[PDB]
Every structure is written in C-alpha cells, then in structure tokens.
C-alpha cells in the first residue's frame, strides 16, 4: 500500500503548515522550503525530536519525539513525493537498517573522525561549543541510522557530507568508530567526563588537597 500518503499529508497539515506552508513552500518568516530535502532529512529531524519546534532560536534542541507507529514513514514519503532528496537506508525486510553498517575497520574510521568530525564534537564524541549560543551535541544516545542521516543531510550549521566526498564505506566505518567509542570501558578508573585537564584539576583540588589538609589539621595542633 505504497500508494497511500493521504496519511502523511494528514499530519503535516495539522502540525507543520504554520511554519512551512501548505505546499511546503517555506513561510518567509520562520521555516525553510523543504522541497529539495528528502526522506532522510525528515527522519533525522523527527526521530530525534528536534521537529515540530517551539519558538525557534539559535539551536532547536533535542527533545522527546512526537511521532511513531509508522507515521515518520508517512511524513517522509509525503515529503519525498515533492522532491528528490536523499532517502533512508533499508534492510531486506523494509525496516530501517543497523549493525551491518559497522565499518569492520575502526582505524580508518577513527582517522576520518579525527580529521572531519572531532573538530566540533570531541576526541571521543563529547560535546563542543560553537559561537554565539550554538553548540555541538554529544554523540552517545544516537543510533546508527541517525548518525548516517545526520552526516548525510547536514543539519543546522553542521556541514553536509555527500555520498561523493564521503562514500558509503567511509560512513559505515565512521558509524562503527562512533558506536565503539561511546560504549568502551575506561581502563584506568573513573573517567572524569571525557574532557581534558579541567575535571582533573578540579578533582585534585577538591579531593586530594582536602584529604591532605584534613590530615594536616588532625596530626598537627592548632594554636
């Protein structure tokens, strides 16, 4: 029943037309056109919850999603029927794919991540701050298809990596590196957040120095 996007253009009309237009034309006040975009953009924007957005400012944050029970497919197909944007990857069942996109190679994936991705996020995918509000979020709770569609559609202020400058193996290997870097142990004790020497200096000053000064107060008399 693929000839059914009457749902789709049933939810868009009651949740989007106030900021994108009835014909997906980009109300000149708030929203962009949404014509050249495809199913991948809608999937990434709605499944992560950044969509339907309230006031709208420097960065729409990630929230709880509103739509599922196969209506993300409905809106995605309805938007794809009005343009030629990229599409979401599918497995031989028709559902959205996963662990087969784990670039069996983590060295190349990590080198590509450090060259292309680590500048804004982190060494290991923690957050990073951009200018005047905007920031780069954490990469821990995003699944594989969300990572692929994120670097494929190029969301707000994030560059757009096509399938010609970043082939599909490159994307799969980057996905594998991200999912491994977010799920590995810390083989040295409790890591203090993923950042550099700021949590380390704080932990020194607030644990080791208070222990030392407390023992100095206990041993030596006060006068």
């Amino acid at each position: 029943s693929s000839a059914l996007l009457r749902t789709g253009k049933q939810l868009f009309d009651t949740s989007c037309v106030s900021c994108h237009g009835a014909n997906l034309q980009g109300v000149p006040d708030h929203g962009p056109s949404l014509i050249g975009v495809g199913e991948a953009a809608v999937y990434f924007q709605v499944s992560t919850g950044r969509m339907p957005a309230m006031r709208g400012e420097a960065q729409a944050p990630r929230k709880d999603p509103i739509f599922d029970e196969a209506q993300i497919d409905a809106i995605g197909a309805y938007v794809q029927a009005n343009g030629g944007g990229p599409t979401v990857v599918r497995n031989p069942d028709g559902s959205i794919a996963t662990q087969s996109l784990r670039g069996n190679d983590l060295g190349r994936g990590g080198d590509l991540f450090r060259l292309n991705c680590a500048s804004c996020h982190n060494f290991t995918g923690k957050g990073g701050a951009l200018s005047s509000g905007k920031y780069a979020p954490d990469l821990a709770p995003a699944n594989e298809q969300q990572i692929l569609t994120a670097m494929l559609t190029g969301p707000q202020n994030m560059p757009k990596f096509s399938n010609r400058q970043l082939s599909f193996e490159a994307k799969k290997d980057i996905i594998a590196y991200v999912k491994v870097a977010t799920e590995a142990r810390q083989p040295g004790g409790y890591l203090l957040g993923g950042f550099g020497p700021a949590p380390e200096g704080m932990a020194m000053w607030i644990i080791g120095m208070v222990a030392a000064i407390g023992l100095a107060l206990w041993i030596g008399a006060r006068s």
Partner: protein, 55 residues
C-alpha cells in the same frame, strides 16, 4: 631535576639553620622556640605524614 634538587637542598638548609618562626602565644618570645624536640616525636610525625601522603 638537578637544579630543583640543588635549590631544595639550599632551601631546607636555610630553614634548618635559621630556626623556624612561630605565632604569638602564652610563652612565646622573639628569643625562643616553643615546641617539641626532634628526638622521639617530630621524626615520627613527619614519617607518618609521608606515609599518609603516599597512600
């Protein structure tokens, strides 16, 4: 490390031969040092502090 070791030696020598300062109190003057002798007590406290810091 060599320069730091030499300077630390000189620092501790100067502190040893110019006796330590002290806070004003009951029996304290500008001409005496009130405290505990090295012999039983001070070496003991210093070594215990060393072990606690290493811990």
């Amino acid at each position: 490390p060599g320069i730091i070791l030499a300077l630390i030696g000189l620092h501790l020598a100067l502190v040893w031969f110019q006796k330590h300062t002290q806070f004003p109190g009951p029996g304290r003057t500008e001409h005496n040092v009130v405290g505990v002798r090295v012999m039983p007590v001070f070496a003991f406290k210093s070594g215990a502090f060393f072990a606690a810091i290493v811990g």
